[PDB]
Design a protein around this ligand. Sequence first.
Ligand SMILES: [Mg+2]
Length: 371
Amino acid sequence: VNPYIGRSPLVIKSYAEKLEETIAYFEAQGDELNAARTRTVQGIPTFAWISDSATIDTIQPLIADAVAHQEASGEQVLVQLVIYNLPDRDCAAKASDGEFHLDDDGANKYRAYVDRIVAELSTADADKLHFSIVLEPDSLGNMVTNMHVPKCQGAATAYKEGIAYTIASLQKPNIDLYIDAAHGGWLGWNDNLRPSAEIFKETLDLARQITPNATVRGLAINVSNYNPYKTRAREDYTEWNNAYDEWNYVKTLTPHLQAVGFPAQFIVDQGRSGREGIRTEWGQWCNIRNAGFGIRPTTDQAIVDSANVDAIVWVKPGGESDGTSDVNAVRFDENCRSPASHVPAPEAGEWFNEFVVNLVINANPPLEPTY
Ligand SMILES: [Mg+2]
């Protein structure tokens, strides 16, 4: 069943707290409407990312807070998590912050990292909650389009085996899993559709060699990207790609999932999708200037308009930088100085207040104020 129906995805307190800076900024500008819209954003659920082992320490406090909230509110709390730590992570990038490396026991270390997450998701408090978990952004798409890259060649089996173990390890009645499936501009090209469906099924099949009746709910798309759910002005760079918005990505990928027997249910990130015409190339991803908050999290079919979409969600938390634009930074990524990037920007994950100011102003539909 669609786990989002009737459920209240969890507001991430640590994220809502960061927005106090944005509220203070608008108040200091004499801008009560945008201050109030930012207050609305504080109440919008986002995903909590587990992108390293240290972050596992945040999970039990998050769960305890979630249970307290469930008791107080009478809601059916749905905790949204991202697992993002495969060994030799981000194999096609020039650099990665992933902490595990295949040549330093990374496969076993990844299993133990998953085991630590499982432990946290196995407490009596965890049992009271429901979870929606996105598995490993920037992973399997590389086996479709980046197999000319030495690091991807060396990591392909490990990505499939890693994700298989994660799936097999999180088979509980209160957990729904969505495997990351990139975005239309990556895997939506005609040549990529069938191989993508095949690798998702292959990975699920591997999971079932570990835990016999293992399942997933489906796929997560547009994670940390900006693609509109429904475009109002198709971009020139989408020429010859039928997945020119994410609703069309769902429509075009679905038949291939069905053909291979992989579940064709999707959650779609729209956290930074409010404004179009902000990029000159589809491949631009880092702190794209003038991005706006998009469609708010919802299961409403009047908006979603697809039996294959479980929900629109906000996976990447807007305001957390994609990377630094400082040319002299140790982790400088040239993508973060693209012609479309917002500069200066702080290190990946650090608060980028100027960017959130713009996410509020450029939100579509406009944010309703909470006065
Ligand atoms: Mg490192």
